[PDB]
Amino acid sequence: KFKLPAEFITRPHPSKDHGKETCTAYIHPNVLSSLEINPGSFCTVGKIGENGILVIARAGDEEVHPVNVITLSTTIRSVGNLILGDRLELKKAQVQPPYATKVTVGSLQGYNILECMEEKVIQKLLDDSGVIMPGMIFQNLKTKAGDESIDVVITDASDDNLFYLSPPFIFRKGSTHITFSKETQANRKYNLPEPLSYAAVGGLDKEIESLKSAIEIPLHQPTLFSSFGVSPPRGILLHGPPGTGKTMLLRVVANTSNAHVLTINGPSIVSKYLGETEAALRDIFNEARKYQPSIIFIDEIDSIAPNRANDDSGEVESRVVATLLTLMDGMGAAGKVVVIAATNRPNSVDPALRRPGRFDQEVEIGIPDVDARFDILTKQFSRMSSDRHVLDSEAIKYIASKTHGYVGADLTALCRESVMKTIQRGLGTDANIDKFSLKVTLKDVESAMVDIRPSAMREIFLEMPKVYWSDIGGQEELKTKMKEMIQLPLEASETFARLGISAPKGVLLYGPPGCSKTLTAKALATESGINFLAVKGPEIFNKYVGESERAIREIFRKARSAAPSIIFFDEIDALSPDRDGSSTSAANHVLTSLLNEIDGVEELKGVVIVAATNRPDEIDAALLRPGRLDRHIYVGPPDVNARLEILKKCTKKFNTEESGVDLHELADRTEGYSGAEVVLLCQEAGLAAIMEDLDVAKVELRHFEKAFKGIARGITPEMLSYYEEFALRSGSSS
Amino acid sequence: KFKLPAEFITRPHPSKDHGKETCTAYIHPNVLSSLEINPGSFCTVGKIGENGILVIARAGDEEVHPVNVITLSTTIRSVGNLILGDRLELKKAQVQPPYATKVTVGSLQGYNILECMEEKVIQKLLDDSGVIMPGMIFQNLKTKAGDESIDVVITDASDDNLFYLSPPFIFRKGSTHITFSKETQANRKYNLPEPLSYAAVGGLDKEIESLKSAIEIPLHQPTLFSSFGVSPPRGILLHGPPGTGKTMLLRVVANTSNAHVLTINGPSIVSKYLGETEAALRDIFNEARKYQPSIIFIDEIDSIAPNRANDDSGEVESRVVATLLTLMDGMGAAGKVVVIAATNRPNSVDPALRRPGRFDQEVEIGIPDVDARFDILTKQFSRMSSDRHVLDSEAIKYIASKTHGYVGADLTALCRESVMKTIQRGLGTDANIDKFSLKVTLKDVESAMVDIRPSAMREIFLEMPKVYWSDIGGQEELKTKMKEMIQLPLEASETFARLGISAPKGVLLYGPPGCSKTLTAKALATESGINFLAVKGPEIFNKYVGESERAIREIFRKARSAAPSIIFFDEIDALSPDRDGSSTSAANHVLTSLLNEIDGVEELKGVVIVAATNRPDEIDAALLRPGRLDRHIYVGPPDVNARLEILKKCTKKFNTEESGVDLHELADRTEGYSGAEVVLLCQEAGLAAIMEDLDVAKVELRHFEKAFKGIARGITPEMLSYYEEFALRSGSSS
Numbered sequence A, B: 001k002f003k004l005p006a007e008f009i010t011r012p013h014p015s016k017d018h019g020k021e022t023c024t025a026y027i028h029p030n031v032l033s034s035l036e037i038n039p040g041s042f043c044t045v046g047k048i049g050e051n052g053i054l055v056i057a058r059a060g061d062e063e064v065h066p067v068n069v070i071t072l073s074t075t076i077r078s079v080g081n082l083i084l085g086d087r088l089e090l091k092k093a094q095v096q097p098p099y100a101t102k103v104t105v106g107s108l109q110g111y112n113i114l115e116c117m118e119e120k121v122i123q124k125l126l127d128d129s130g131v132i133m134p135g136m137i138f139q140n141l142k143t144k145a146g147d148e149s150i151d152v153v154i155t156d157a158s159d160d161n162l163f164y165l166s167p168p169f170i171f172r173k174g175s176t177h178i179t180f181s182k183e184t185q186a187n188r189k190y191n192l193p194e195p196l197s198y199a200a201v202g203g204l205d206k207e208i209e210s211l212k213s214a215i216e217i218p219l220h221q222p223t224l225f226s227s228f229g230v231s232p233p234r235g236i237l238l239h240g241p242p243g244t245g246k247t248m249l250l251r252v253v254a255n256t257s258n259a260h261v262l263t264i265n266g267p268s269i270v271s272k273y274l275g276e277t278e279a280a281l282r283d284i285f286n287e288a289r290k291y292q293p294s295i296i297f298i299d300e301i302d303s304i305a306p307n308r309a310n311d312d313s314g315e316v317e318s319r320v321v322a323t324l325l326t327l328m329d330g331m332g333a334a335g336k337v338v339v340i341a342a343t344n345r346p347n348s349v350d351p352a353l354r355r356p357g358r359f360d361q362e363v364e365i366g367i368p369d370v371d372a373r374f375d376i377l378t379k380q381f382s383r384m385s386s387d388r389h390v391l392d393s394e395a396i397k398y399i400a401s402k403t404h405g406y407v408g409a410d411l412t413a414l415c416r417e418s419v420m421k422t423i424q425r426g427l428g429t430d431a432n433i434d435k436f437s438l439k440v441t442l443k444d445v446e447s448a449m450v451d452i453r454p455s456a457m458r459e460i461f462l463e464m465p466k467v468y469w470s471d472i473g474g475q476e477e478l479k480t481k482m483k484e485m486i487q488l489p490l491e492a493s494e495t496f497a498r499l500g501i502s503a504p505k506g507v508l509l510y511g512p513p514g515c516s517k518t519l520t521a522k523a524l525a526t527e528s529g530i531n532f533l534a535v536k537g538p539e540i541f542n543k544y545v546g547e548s549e550r551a552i553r554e555i556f557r558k559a560r561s562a563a564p565s566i567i568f569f570d571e572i573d574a575l576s577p578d579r580d581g582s583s584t585s586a587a588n589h590v591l592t593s594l595l596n597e598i599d600g601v602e603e604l605k606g607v608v609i610v611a612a613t614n615r616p617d618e619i620d621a622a623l624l625r626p627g628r629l630d631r632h633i634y635v636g637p638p639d640v641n642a643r644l645e646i647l648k649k650c651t652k653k654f655n656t657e658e659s660g661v662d663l664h665e666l667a668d669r670t671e672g673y674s675g676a677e678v679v680l681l682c683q684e685a686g687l688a689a690i691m692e693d694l695d696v697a698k699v700e701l702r703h704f705e706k707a708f709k710g711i712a713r714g715i716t717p718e719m720l721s722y723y724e725e726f727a728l729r730s731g732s733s734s
């Protein structure tokens, strides 16, 4: 008794697609007999659990075709997004689709179908197709010039449903109005599965290029590699943050290639007892060997190959890893098969799968930067941009600037929640709203992301508030010094590379606490015209595996790898103290990392290391001397006019001037109050404001008078003396 | 009711000769019945997780044949390289394999079969064989008149749904041509497993023969010891750094020796249920006793048999070690059983497990010598085709001498990376180039070696901007003496050896700050070729009771493992406080650990120490003693002719001579300057020049004139008199 397989395997149809064989997917005649299916008859082909698609049953050769294999012309696989290795469910159809009266025909790129190709050849393809559902493609179509490939998609067909993903219509010549259209997708109401192509993967062009090379080299041309007697780089591994296009990159690799896509599912490949896990792995790799070229995907390989050094690993992990070691290192030198693995983090995968010959090639998928978010946002925003009509591309930069932490996944969730808030905006404006009349808006998008948890954390990007050289409080002497000395060496970069001389290394920005110290570095991050970076004091300084001597190296590597940078070292004096008999901290590592990084082989073409301090006498002597820091200047608390404009800056939502006391009046009233202490006076006044009216009021002069009492003179002569004592040393050769 | 085994134990036939029993697998009657494998019918037997071998089933004697065992001939086992004790599946094949048309036969020995044997012999062998598959070896066939015996191999088989490891074919006398060949292995098309052999192991010759002796006598000649009234040595332990080839030895021992082969793959036996790990060990040793002779392998013994006295070893480790101890020497007997184990940490193995009677022998497997590395490289490169282009001896000998501290895994990685480099160069030439002819040229090996790191050196991070002797201005005396120390003793080894003289193995470079002290160490590092470990003064002054001495000892351990190597102790004055009043530092014992490591009860052969101090008399007389720091070199300030060379080096990208800037005047007027101050002079003149312009202003003598006005002489006459005084009491006749 012949046994009918439950699931059939999609595979190419060596016959051409231009013929009458569009929906005549050849089926093994034994299956045709065993399922009461007549030749040239319609039957439903579809993935498990999905709505069916219509194919015409045609008998194939018994010997050539194995029983399971079902061959589809490449026109119908694109209907239901049938990629190779997709298990099917053959069933017998019962209703013959009616003929067609109108068909709207699309194109890939919007090319004028009238101008490029004849109507006769298009009609020939369509008629010979016989039955047309919305969603196929007619490929490799020769044009009038003979050198252009334009593909005929079909947007819709109308005649003047259940368990069918789309209802076809039997295209017949004579009255079918073939009205060509610029739409690049099938009819939207049915929503036939959209391919996840390369143009939906934005933000990882370099990484996708590396992945493409790693897939092509073992997949298409392993023979010429194998002549050398050492196995190809079959094993590729993807790792990085657990939100950045990992499974999506695997899915696009599945879609684009024409290589038989197998899949090593994590949980479902394993049944029970013995000889089931190894049986599954053997069978799947053997099938990937029979049908070539093939890709073997292992998404989240960690869930089945932990280190065996953790209590998680049991018998099953030992089975999976042993079988994979036996297989992946055994096959080769002729098989056109690649194994691609991805993981949230790779470091917990058994090394036996990581040695060369096993997964040894790597693709690093990294956090998207501020400039990286633009492509993600715009391409994500494409699916309905015709109904956005709001972008104009400028809000996208703002979003990218304010989404430090989002990993692309959260950006897509932001799109989802924005669409929700647009639906609810339509409902709130009018209960019986028409959503299609709505264009999404940035205000409701803001009302949207104000209710999502952003991401894991922010690593190389900070708030970086907008500060300008046009607003920094007075101190035109400070301004002129910092310009002359930190922008000139950042201008002369090639002229140092030629003439062979290293560039000045950095400035230390002497000054008492609470000044514009780093708030000027905020302008460096806003209006310098040069990208910025910082570590706000002893974050990296702490004693951890990746902080003792590693995080400094990573920070410098990111900064140097970028365009010129003004890397910042807030309170370097407190970070690494003198440690020469006075204030001996226990780190001993971070200063060594800085010493080995700043002075060494690295290029550091576009890099200047700025730092900040309020107790400069505590800096390690290895920094003051030229070689690590060789520029040195002093920042003072704001002068009377700088204090005028800092007083202006403190207020952001108060009307003291017109109602109360002029801000201009306060300019000289504030003496001994540092840039972060005039803030203290203003904030004490603001807290006192909510004590008199308690709901809504201006402030009083006496509020600022109480600010004067409650906060004594901040900038006292002690710091003047301590500085000038240190400055007679720093300023002079002593 | 009868329960068929889930996995089956391989075993040999009692009959060693060739007949109609050859391709027959003797399976138990009940198992035959339960899979319905009717006697005489075809069945497939193959390791779990691999493709099967077709074998024709017979019955075993139901009372003396164990249920688990299938017995297979050496001919069949040669196909899949099935070692005795391998766990086989057994599955019915409802098939009749195809007839043969042309069968190819070869011989391991490569001798002409027409000359050695009569074709009727081969015809009879094949006819009786019943089945033909590529990969079969018919061993011990006698030559003409019994001259010798030859092994004959079925290299290929051709005929003009199950899946098999080798194609099954049938021999039908006369109608299938027995075509001879000289290929000593089966056709490479088939991916047949290829036996690993001792010829693939490099070096370790004496260790290999020790393994041969301790494997052969206990298993294959015990009555010799029973005759001599002594017990057999039932234990071998292999210890040595990782990557030296310990598992390779175990696999070759498994595949070469004719014995029941069992493996405890450390964590593979472990279970979370109370007594199951111990029960796995008992079953393994009882199986070894049952089928004799038997070899039991334990790779990483330390993973399952820890010290049993240390803190983390609780009751579970105690019970597992007790099981191992009692199964090796207890109230039970051993039999013809030998246990072979491997470990990277011999002292972490339980001390009572290494006593004679258990692991009697400890065959050390250490890092390779230059001869050993040459052997490994020749055997690795013998695996390739005639695309090597590395002269079998010369180029490989250069690569072997240039590899210092390599262990053997890294050498295989180097060969694979060389293949990678050659083929990426091929891709960079053109994508469609005929790669196979892209011989790996020695420069490809060089490009590969710069991208690999010796096993003993992954953790030795260095920035090391590739300093060369010519960078050091002058100092010809120091250069000559450092050539004496580092280079010559290896480039003239036989001369020193024949004179009975070991070259001095310590030097102290002392002199004012900013001379060529550290730069000469870096020049040695990046010109001597040998490894180079670096240390600094206060980086190894942890504040715990014994953590600094541990740093010293770890450094010297790595230096020994990576010898030839330099250890450069910059700021050796930090490591040498007397603490009696001279350098009254903390109560640390770093000096003593350094003293004992340099010259103690252990010898420290092969390492050379270079120490640099700018305060030479603050060093202990014991450390300056010959045998610790033999030669004391005074690296003083550069004289005029060295200054001129410095200026020529750094100013070459200036157009000084085209501008009339006479370097003679600069050299003469920079008298008594520190050489670092000469470099500073030129770099500061460059700053001055490129401060007037953002474009390239060629330096001018007046910018140098400005420079001279600021750079103070860092070397006072006091320092010079001090160092010249130390250069009289020590390292001088006085």
Ligand SMILES: Nc1ncnc2c1ncn2[C@@H]1O[C@H](COP(=O)(O)OP(=O)(O)OP(O)(O)=S)[C@@H](O)[C@H]1O
Residues within 6 Å of the ligand: A200, A201, A202, A203, A204, A241, A242, A243, A244, A245, A246, A247, A248, A249, A300, A343, A344, A376, A407, A408, A409, A412
């Ligand atoms: N360039 C991009 N970077 C990141 N995500 C993107 C990008 N482009 C689109 N996305 C969307 O990101 C969403 C989530 O990405 P996924 O790859 O599915 O997450 P993941 O890679 O599975 O993460 P894990 O937990 O490490 S497996 C998808 O629905 C994509 O539509």
Ligand SMILES: Nc1ncnc2c1ncn2[C@@H]1O[C@H](COP(=O)(O)OP(=O)(O)OP(O)(O)=S)[C@@H](O)[C@H]1O
Residues within 6 Å of the ligand: B200, B201, B202, B203, B241, B242, B243, B244, B245, B246, B247, B248, B299, B300, B342, B376, B407, B408, B409, B412
């Ligand atoms: N002559 C050789 N000596 C050493 N290794 C060799 C040699 N020839 C090849 N190799 C390779 O080097 C490795 C030797 O096996 P390894 O298991 O890595 O050594 P081992 O680390 O001492 O054993 P372990 O730690 O129990 S896995 C393998 O990857 C071999 O392919």
Ligand SMILES: Nc1ncnc2c1ncn2[C@@H]1O[C@H](COP(=O)(O)OP(=O)(O)OP(O)(O)=S)[C@@H](O)[C@H]1O
Residues within 6 Å of the ligand: B471, B472, B473, B474, B475, B512, B513, B514, B515, B516, B517, B518, B519, B520, B570, B612, B614, B638, B642, B646, B674, B675, B676, B677, B679
């Ligand atoms: N012949 C030379 N004499 C002195 N310095 C030289 C010479 N040639 C080059 N230099 C440069 O001068 C500087 C001297 O640096 P080092 O070699 O570290 O001197 P050093 O005496 O080891 O300093 P220490 O160890 O901190 S006391 C480096 O920038 C060298 O590149």
